[PDB]
Specification:
Elements (H helix, E strand, L loop, with lengths): L7 H4 L7 E3 L1 E3 L6 H5 L9 E3 L4 E7 L14 E7 L2 H13 L4 E8 L5 E7 L13 H11 L1
Antiparallel strand pairs: 1-7, 2-5, 3-4, 4-5, 6-7
Bound molecules: magnesium ion (MG) (136 copies).
The site of one magnesium ion has 4 residues, from loops.
The chain binds 13 RNA strands through helix 3 and helix 4.
InterPro entries: SmpB (IPR023620), SsrA-bd_prot (IPR000037), SsrA-bd_prot_CS (IPR020081)
Subcellular location: Cytoplasm
Organism: Thermus thermophilus (strain ATCC 27634 / DSM 579 / HB8)
Length: about 140
RNA sequence: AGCUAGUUGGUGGGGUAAUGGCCCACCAAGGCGACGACGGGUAGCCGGUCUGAGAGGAUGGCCGGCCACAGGGGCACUGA
RNA sequence: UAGCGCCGGCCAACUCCGUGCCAGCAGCCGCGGUAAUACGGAGGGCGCGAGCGUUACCCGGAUUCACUGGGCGUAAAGGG
RNA sequence: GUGGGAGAGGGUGGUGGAAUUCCCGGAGUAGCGGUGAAAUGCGCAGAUACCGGGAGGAACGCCGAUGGCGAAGGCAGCCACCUGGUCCACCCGUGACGCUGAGGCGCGAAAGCGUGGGGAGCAAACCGGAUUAGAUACCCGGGUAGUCCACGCCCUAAACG
RNA sequence: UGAAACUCAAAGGAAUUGACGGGGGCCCGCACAAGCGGUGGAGCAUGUGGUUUAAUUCGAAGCAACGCGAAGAACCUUACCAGGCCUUGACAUGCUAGGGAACCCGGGUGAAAGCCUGGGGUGCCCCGCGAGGGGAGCCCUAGCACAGGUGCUGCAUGGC
RNA sequence: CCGGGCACUCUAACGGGACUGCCCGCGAAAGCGGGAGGAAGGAGGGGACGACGUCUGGUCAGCAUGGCCCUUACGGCCUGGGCGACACACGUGCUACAAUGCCCACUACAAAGCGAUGCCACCCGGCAACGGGGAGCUAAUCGCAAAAAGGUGGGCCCAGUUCGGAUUGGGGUCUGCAACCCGACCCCAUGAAGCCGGAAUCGCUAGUAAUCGCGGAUCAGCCAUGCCGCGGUGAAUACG
RNA sequence: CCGAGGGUAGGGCCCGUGACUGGGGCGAAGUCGUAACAAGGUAGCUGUACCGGAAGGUGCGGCUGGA
RNA sequence: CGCGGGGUGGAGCAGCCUGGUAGCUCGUCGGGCUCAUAACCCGAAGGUCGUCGGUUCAAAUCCGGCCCCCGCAACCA
RNA sequence: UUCAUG
RNA sequence: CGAGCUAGCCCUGGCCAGGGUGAAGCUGGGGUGAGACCCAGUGGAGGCCCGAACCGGUGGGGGAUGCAAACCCCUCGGAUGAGCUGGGGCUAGGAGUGAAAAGCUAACCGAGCCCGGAGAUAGCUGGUUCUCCCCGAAAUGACUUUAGGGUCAGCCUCAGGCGCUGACUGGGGCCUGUAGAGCACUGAUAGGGCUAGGGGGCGCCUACCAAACCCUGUCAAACUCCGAAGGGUCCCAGGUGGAGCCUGGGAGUGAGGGCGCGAGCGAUAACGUCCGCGUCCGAGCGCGGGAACAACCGAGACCGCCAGCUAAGGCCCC
RNA sequence: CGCAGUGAACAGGCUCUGGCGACUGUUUACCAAAAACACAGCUCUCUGCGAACUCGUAAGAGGAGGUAUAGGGAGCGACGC
RNA sequence: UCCUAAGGUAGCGAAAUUCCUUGUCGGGUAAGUUCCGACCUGCACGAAAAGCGUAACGACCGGAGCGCUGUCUCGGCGAGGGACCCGGUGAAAUUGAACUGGCCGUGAAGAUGCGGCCUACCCGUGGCAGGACGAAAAGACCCCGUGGAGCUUUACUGCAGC
RNA sequence: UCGAUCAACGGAUAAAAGUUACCCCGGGGAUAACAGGCUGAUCUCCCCCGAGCGUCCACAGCGGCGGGGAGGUUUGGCACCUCGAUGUCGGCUCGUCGCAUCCUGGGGCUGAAGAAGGUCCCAAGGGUUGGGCUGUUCGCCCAUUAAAGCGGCACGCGAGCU
RNA sequence: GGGGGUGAAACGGUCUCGACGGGGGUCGCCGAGGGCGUGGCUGCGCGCCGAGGUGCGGGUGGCCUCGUAAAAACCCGCA
C-alpha cells in the first residue's frame, strides 16, 4: 500500500551503476510500518556474509498492535536475489571495489515489498580543498 | 520617578550615661529627590590579597580591626 | 618512587601503523572521504617534574568601556 | 542703532493663463485608445480629432541652474498685507551680555487618522485586458480612499552633506 | 524608551585581481544574415542509452562521449559468461636437490586443453682402449622466493 | 613498340622569385585605398605549428607506475557461446524517394597509392563471383586498373514505376580447421518502407559546398556506407 | 499603650507553570516561487498605507548607497 | 428512511439526441529546445463510457432496478 | 525586451 | 355610536420631601513670550446617584366561585425628566393610534360595539313531540374539486297491470382454464454423464470452474400438453311464494362489522386492512348455552297459560 | 454600663467573570419588560418649494407660515477598528 | 481542472448560530452535557437583516467564588388569621337516577352496576386526594369543512395612486 | 371539420399560489400525537442443535450458522374507547408489586488450593447511598457501599406540588 | 449497547511481482556421498610362532629383514 520510498542520501551519494529489484524476507511482523512509510536507510547498505545478502542496519518501527510482540528494529534482514546473481555480486564485491546500497522499498502487484538494490562506486564529489596561504608558505619555507 | 505623614520642624515632657522623632502630647506644613530620593537585585566592610606596566579591574579565604548574628523573631532584667 | 601533559598552526616537539566524514579530537581555526605530522596505538621528541593535566572563577592580554588610552561620512555610532 | 540689500523663508487674502476632464451648442464620419505587440475599453446612441461658450479642481511651463532662501522638514504663476531669518557698510552704543545644552517646549516631508468641505487630473485597494507555467506584478484600460482646503492629531524617513 | 535567553565565529567598510551581466564602447569567427546542400520523415549500416542476458567485456557522457579506444569481434582478437582443466604457471630469473640433462616418434581418454603412456637417449667439463666420476648449457619432477592480474583508484601519478 | 633521339610534360634535388619591392592618394609614423609589371599579392593558398593555465577534463583498458586487493584464483590453457541479442530511444553516416533521373552498350579523361609467399596481366571454363594454366614485377619498368561522373546514341515516359533495393527463399564461389549464431561477394526470385520530410538542427566563404569514383591502413576473409588520403565536375552568396 | 507572631482583606514586584498561539534560531543536497547583488531581466533602499501563499507589489514622497 | 442528481481517458469534465457519428484541458510516452531541470514546441496513444437486465438490428445514449458519491427533505405532535 | 532554476 | 378606559398629539395648569456626587464657567495662584494647560476656592450641571410621595410592576408568596372579570403583601425599577398628572380638546374601524406588542381603541381587537341586509350560510353537530298494524333495507358499483355529501343503478315499500315466469332443484347441452397436477411451452432449477467459448504453461491439452443434449430430480399469480368440484347461461320440467316481470309514487342507503372459506397487503401478526362467495350483528340480542360477552353454537320473540316435546349445552352443588 | 450603642423601626449582600444590548427610557392594560422597540449617531435615497410625501372624492390641511446644515423614506443603531 | 455573475476578505468561531456533539484539549470542581479559554472539516458566522471589540450601564441571561442562612441532610417548636366546635346569616359550580365495595376476568379494548369469588352492620364528623375516564372550557395541538378571517407574493383578476 | 397535458383526463373558472405559533368557527376519536387495547416485526429474557474455541476437553465459561418461545417495559404496526377534552416529560412526595436478583440467605458445578470469583438453581423478607453535569428519564463520572437492581403500576403519581 | 467499516485491492480459482535459505520430491550420469556390486578377465596365495639393525640408545612391533631357521636403521638426543 506504501508508495515508492527513497534512499535519499544514497541516491544523492553513490553512483548507481546498475540496479536489481531484490527481495526481503520479513521475519514476521515488520510489515505495516514499512507499508506506512517508517524506514530510514541512513547508515545502512546490503552486506553479504560469505553466502547470502542481508540488508544491514535498517531501522523499521515495531508495529504498535504488537504491544509486546516487538522486534529488534535495526537488524540485518535476509535479502533475496537469484543464485547466479548472488554469487555474481559475491564475486563482484572483490572484483570491483563496490558498496551495495538500496534505493527504495517499493511494492509490486503481488502486494509484496522489494528493496531496489543498486551498485556504488562512491561518486567522489567531496572537494579536497586547495591549500591555504599559511600552509603553502611554510612548505615554501621548508623549501628554502 | 517620585518618596515620606513621626515623615520634617518647634515647644513641653518622658527615657537614656548622653544628643537626638530615641518615644509621647499640642502646633507648623515640612523633609528628601536625576549630584539618583524611593523601590528592587546583590553584598558583611576595611587593612589587605590576586592581577596589572601603571592607572585600574576583581576579591575580602587564612591573619588583624569594626559591625551583625548565636535555631527564626521579639523582649527586658542583672551589670561598668 | 617517576610520572603527567603535549607534538597541524597559535605552542617547544614527527615518523610509522590501525582507522576511513567512521571511531573519535577540539580552546579557536579546523582534522577525519585510503598515503591523517590534528583520531586510536607504537617509536621518538618537547615541556614540566612529585607533579602534570582538566574544569570553574577572577585579572591580564582586552587600547574590546579607552583617565593615561577609542571613535562616530561609508565600518557599530550624529539626536530630524 | 543708521542706511540699504537679495530671497521658491513663513502665514493670510485675492488673482492669471495654459492644459486635463466634464457639460452645452456648431461641424464632423468610422473609428478612437493602447502598447514591445495586443485585447479590455470608449464608439454608428454620432466616439476620436475640430471650433465656440461655460463649469470646476489642482499644479504652476518658460525664467530655472551645477541657482536662492530655510535650522530641519521643505519652499516655484503673479499681486497685496503681516512677519521671521540673514548679509554688507559705517565703528555709532551696551560692556563678556558668550558657546553648547540631559529633561522640556515648538516645528517636523510623504503616508495615516478625525470632523466638515472640495473632487479636474493622477491614483493605492479593487475590477478587467493581455502578459506568463503561474502573475496576487511590470504594460494597458477603468477605479475608490487619498492626493486638495480648514481645524486638529500622528511624529516616523535614505528627516543624508 | 528598549533588554536578555538563545545562537553564530562571523557580520561588515574601502580597495585589488578575476569571473559574470538579459551593462556600455570597439573588434571578431559559417556565429547570425545572404545562400547551397543536408540531418530530423523512410530503409539500411555503425556507435550509444535502456531492456534482455549465463554474458550481451570494459572505458568514453554537453560543446570537449555517441562511424569513439577498435586502422578489421566467425575461433583468435577477448578482457565476458558457461564448461573441461593446470598449478612457482604462458612466462623473468635465482636457490636446495634424487632425477632426466640438448631430443624425436606416436598410442589411448578427450570438445579441445589437459591427463595417463611407450620406443630412440646428448658433442663437451673430463680422468677417457677403463669401470666411470666430479660436472658445464638446455629440459622435466619435487619445493622455494615469487611470477601474474584487461582487479580498483586517471581526484595518488608520469606519459600522451 | 622501337630503330635515331630527351626537345619538352615530368621526376627530385638545388636555386631564384614577392619584399610594400616600385609609384600615386591618405597618414604623425606604422600602414591603408588604388595602379603597374609579374605566374602570384599585400599572412599568394594550404599544412605542421598550438602560450601561462582551466575543465580535480580523458586514458591504471596502449605503456610506465604509488597504493590496496586476488594468489590451487580476480592468475593460466582450451572448447563452445557472447561482444552482433531488441520492446524502443538517440548520434553519426549511407542509399533513396527519380526524368538534370534510371538501365544497357561503346569510347575517353586523374592523382594518390600498394604488392616475393603477394599484385595477378593474358588465355581456357563458368552468365557471374570465381576456378585451372601462366606472363611480368625484387616495381616511374609488370600488376591492382575498371576510373566514375562526363560524352556517344538506344531504351524508360511522371508511373511507387526499367525510381527505390530493404527484406525473404533458392542456386552458389572465395577465405579460413571452421560462415549456424555472425563473413564477404555472385546469380535468380522477392520488390517493402520511402513520392523531399514535424518541432528543430547542421555543414560550407573557392576548386570550398555539392556530386563522382579511386587508393591505402588494419587485414586470411571482413564492417568499409567508417577513417585517412587522392583527384574528376564544380557552383550560389557574404547587403551587413 | 507599644508589642514578635497568627488571622483576614487588598495591593506591588519577581519567579515557576499553563491548552494553545505569535514569532525566532537551527537542522537534513524538502516543496513553493525569484525578491536582492550585473540597467537582477520592473533601479534599489527607506518612511507609511493598502493588498498579496511568500519573498513582495503598488500608491505618495524622499534618497543615490542608481543611470 | 423516501425523493433527484451524477457517474465518460491517470485525474477533472464536455458529452453521446433516439440510439450507429466519443472527446477537452492538464497529466503521459517519444522527440525538439536547454550545459541540465523548468516552461514552451512537435508526433501520437490511452477509456469494460457506474455494474447488471431490458425492448432494440445495434446501447454510453432510452427503460428499469442495485452499489458508491452529491444535493435535498425527515415537518405538526 | 522577452524567459524561472541549478 | 364611542378617544370619560387606553394609545398618541394640542392648549392650559399643577407635582417631584430630602440628602449626595461636583461639570462648565468665574476668582486667585502656578505656568508661558502670550497661551493651551495644572492646582485650590467658588459655582451647581445632569435623560447624574441613594431615596419618599408619584409613576410602574421585577422576583416570590398569597389570592383562583378572590377583597379584586388583574387584587394584597414582601421586594424592586424610574423618581428634574424621552418625567408624572388634573382640566379643556383632536384623531374611529380596514380606519385611528402605536418608542411596534398586531398592542390599544369602553373588562375578550389579526380589524371595536350597536342596529340594519338577516331567519346570511353551514355538504356540519344537536333535536324533532300520540298509538296500533303490515312489509322492511343498505353501508356495494359507476361518477364525481369527490371521499363524512350527492346523482344513477343495486337492496326497500306502496298502488296498478301482467299471471307461474321467480330464488332453489332435476334432466340435457354448452362455456371456462382456478384447485389439483405436469414440464408440452416462458422462466427458475438439484445430482450424474456428455461436451461448444474463457482459467492452469497452453501446442492438440486440465474438475459439470462452463450453452445444447442426456437420464434422474423438482417449482411457479404473472408457465399450461392436461385440468375436476363447481359456477354461469339457455331449454324442458318441479317450484302459489310478502315469488317474480313491467309502469308509476315514496324512499332510505352509499362509515359497515365479526365469523367461515378463497386470496391479496402485513410478518404463513392484529378485535389489522382490502376484495369474492356466503352467513350473522347491523335492525334479531329479544331468548337458551357459551361464567359474563353484537356477530361462537341453538333458534327468527303477535299475546297469554303455575301444560308438553326438544335443539346447542349440560345432569355432584352453586 | 451593657452580650448588643443607626441598642427599636426604616434601612445595599458583595466580588470575579461571559453573552446580549451602548446607556436613561418604552411596550405586549389583564401570563412575556427582554437580547425586543426607541435612542443620539452612521450611510443611502428622494424633494428647488403650488417640495417630495401624507390625509382628504375636491377644496384644503399637515409638510412648514419650514427651504438641502431643511424636510420625507429606508437601513444600521453610542464610541473604537 | 469544471462551473459561476462572483467563489466568503478582515474579524470571529462547537457561538444566543455546531446536526454528529457531552467535538478535542486545557481551567474551575472531588466529580462540570452548563461556564470560561483554546484548536478550528463553520450540517449552516461574517461585515450597516452589519462584523469584531468595548469602560459605564442592566428588576436581562448564563457560570463561578466569598459571606450568611430552615434552601436542604431533616425536621422541630412557638405565635397570629383561617381550619375545628357552638350561636347568627348562609351561597356556588355540579347534578340521569342511584339502595354507589375489592379482586380476577369480561365487555366499544381502563367497570360500584356484567359474571365468579372475597370482604362488608346503618349513619355521620375531621382528614388525604387514588378513582368515579371527577369539574371546568361543544380540543386551544391534528384532521375534515369545496368553512372564515389576518398576512404575504414574481397566484388570478380588479381598484386606489402614478 | 378545426382550437383541450380542459392529463386534477365525466372536463368547477375563459382566468388563480402561499402562510398562520395571532388565529377563529362548525365537526371528528370517521383521523393523529399521550395513555390503554390487539399484535410482538423490533427490544429484553431463557430455550433447542451444537459446529468451533477454552493446550487436552462441544458444555466451568463460552457458544458460529440456524431454529422454537415467553414477556409486554423499547421503537413501532393497527386506529378499538376518549377530541361536548383521557393534562403531557422529568424531578419532589408517597409508595405498592413482579422476578427475569444488584446485595443479603441457601445451593449446584467450576478451568473451585485458600481468599476470591464465574455460571446456573431456589429465593422479594429487608434493603438498593450522597454528590457533579444535563430539563432530563438514561447516561458519563466523584466518594462510598455488602448493593448502589431491571421494570410495572395512564413511560405510577399535577381534584398532591413543581 | 447495537448497525456500518479496515487491521496486503478484479464480487474467487493461485503463488512467495521470479528468485534466498529451511522441508520434501523429480531428472540424469559423476561414479561413486555409500555399496549388493559384477563377468570376458586373470593366482601359485607370503601372516603366525619370531629375533636383529645406523656414531655413545629410552623411542619407532612390524615404519624393514628373513626360514631347520639370522640382514639392512628412513628419523630423533646428536662434544
Ligand atoms: Mg565535506
Ligand atoms: Mg576535501
Ligand atoms: Mg581562509
Ligand atoms: Mg547603663
Ligand atoms: Mg525618626
Ligand atoms: Mg592593561
Ligand atoms: Mg538574631
Ligand atoms: Mg529560636
Ligand atoms: Mg542596670
Ligand atoms: Mg614548532
Ligand atoms: Mg565505523
Ligand atoms: Mg588528544
Ligand atoms: Mg587502505
Ligand atoms: Mg594512515
Ligand atoms: Mg577579559
Ligand atoms: Mg582594561
Ligand atoms: Mg579619555
Ligand atoms: Mg555600516
Ligand atoms: Mg542619526
Ligand atoms: Mg490661504
Ligand atoms: Mg542656505
Ligand atoms: Mg566702538
Ligand atoms: Mg498627508
Ligand atoms: Mg480615524
Ligand atoms: Mg484625512
Ligand atoms: Mg492569469
Ligand atoms: Mg476613511
Ligand atoms: Mg509628520
Ligand atoms: Mg513609521
Ligand atoms: Mg538630503
Ligand atoms: Mg533629505
Ligand atoms: Mg538573452
Ligand atoms: Mg532519419
Ligand atoms: Mg530521412
Ligand atoms: Mg555501452
Ligand atoms: Mg566527442
Ligand atoms: Mg565467435
Ligand atoms: Mg571468438
Ligand atoms: Mg618440479
Ligand atoms: Mg581514492
Ligand atoms: Mg593525465
Ligand atoms: Mg601564399
Ligand atoms: Mg595500478
Ligand atoms: Mg578501468
Ligand atoms: Mg603494460
Ligand atoms: Mg583467465
Ligand atoms: Mg562493439
Ligand atoms: Mg544517414
Ligand atoms: Mg543510376
Ligand atoms: Mg596497398
Ligand atoms: Mg589459373
Ligand atoms: Mg610503385
Ligand atoms: Mg605514377
Ligand atoms: Mg530532405
Ligand atoms: Mg519552427
Ligand atoms: Mg580506399
Ligand atoms: Mg569498424
Ligand atoms: Mg533531511
Ligand atoms: Mg526587486
Ligand atoms: Mg531577482
Ligand atoms: Mg528585479
Ligand atoms: Mg516596473
Ligand atoms: Mg541598483
Ligand atoms: Mg491580507
Ligand atoms: Mg518585499
Ligand atoms: Mg497591487
Ligand atoms: Mg476520451
Ligand atoms: Mg474519474
Ligand atoms: Mg414543531
Ligand atoms: Mg516577449
Ligand atoms: Mg518568465
Ligand atoms: Mg527550486
Ligand atoms: Mg363619534
Ligand atoms: Mg405611547
Ligand atoms: Mg471655580
Ligand atoms: Mg448639583
Ligand atoms: Mg436621575
Ligand atoms: Mg401586581
Ligand atoms: Mg425603589
Ligand atoms: Mg421604585
Ligand atoms: Mg432614585
Ligand atoms: Mg377630557
Ligand atoms: Mg392597527
Ligand atoms: Mg383575525
Ligand atoms: Mg372592522
Ligand atoms: Mg342564523
Ligand atoms: Mg339576504
Ligand atoms: Mg362527499
Ligand atoms: Mg397450484
Ligand atoms: Mg422447465
Ligand atoms: Mg408459456
Ligand atoms: Mg367464478
Ligand atoms: Mg360516499
Ligand atoms: Mg337477522
Ligand atoms: Mg345472549
Ligand atoms: Mg325432555
Ligand atoms: Mg436599629
Ligand atoms: Mg438596554
Ligand atoms: Mg402582559
Ligand atoms: Mg427591566
Ligand atoms: Mg410583565
Ligand atoms: Mg407653519
Ligand atoms: Mg437593529
Ligand atoms: Mg468552530
Ligand atoms: Mg456542546
Ligand atoms: Mg474538567
Ligand atoms: Mg447546572
Ligand atoms: Mg454557520
Ligand atoms: Mg449588510
Ligand atoms: Mg461580540
Ligand atoms: Mg437592565
Ligand atoms: Mg451552576
Ligand atoms: Mg422549614
Ligand atoms: Mg359502603
Ligand atoms: Mg375491569
Ligand atoms: Mg345490576
Ligand atoms: Mg380521590
Ligand atoms: Mg374532565
Ligand atoms: Mg368540537
Ligand atoms: Mg374546494
Ligand atoms: Mg379582515
Ligand atoms: Mg387581469
Ligand atoms: Mg373549465
Ligand atoms: Mg376528475
Ligand atoms: Mg393578541
Ligand atoms: Mg406577532
Ligand atoms: Mg383509556
Ligand atoms: Mg410473543
Ligand atoms: Mg426464533
Ligand atoms: Mg401493560
Ligand atoms: Mg378510532
Ligand atoms: Mg381526547
Ligand atoms: Mg479449591
Ligand atoms: Mg423490592
Ligand atoms: Mg406518567
Ligand atoms: Mg396543576
Amino acid at each position: 500500500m506504501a508508495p515508492v520510498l527513497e534512499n535519499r542520501r544514497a541516491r544523492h551519494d553513490y553512483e548507481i551503476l546498475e540496479t536489481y529489484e531484490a527481495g526481503i524476507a520479513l521475519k514476521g511482523t515488520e510489515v505495516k510500518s514499512l507499508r506506512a512509510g517508517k524506514v530510514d536507510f541512513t547508515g545502512s547498505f546490503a552486506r553479504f556474509e560469505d553466502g547470502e545478502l542481508y540488508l544491514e542496519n535498517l531501522y523499521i518501527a515495531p508495529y504498535e498492535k504488537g504491544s509486546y510482540a516487538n522486534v529488534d528494529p535495526r537488524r540485518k534482514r535476509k535479502l533475496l536475489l537469484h543464485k547466479h546473481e548472488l554469487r555474481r555480486l559475491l564475486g563482484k564485491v572483490e572484483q570491483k571495489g563496490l558498496t551495495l546500497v538500496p534505493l527504495k522499498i517499493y511494492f509490486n502487484e503481488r502486494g509484496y515489498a522489494k528493496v531496489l538494490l543498486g551498485l556504488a562506486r562512491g561518486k567522489k564529489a567531496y572537494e579536497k580543498r586547495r591549500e591555504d596561504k599559511k600552509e603553502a608558505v611554510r612548505r615554501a619555507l621548508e623549501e628554502l
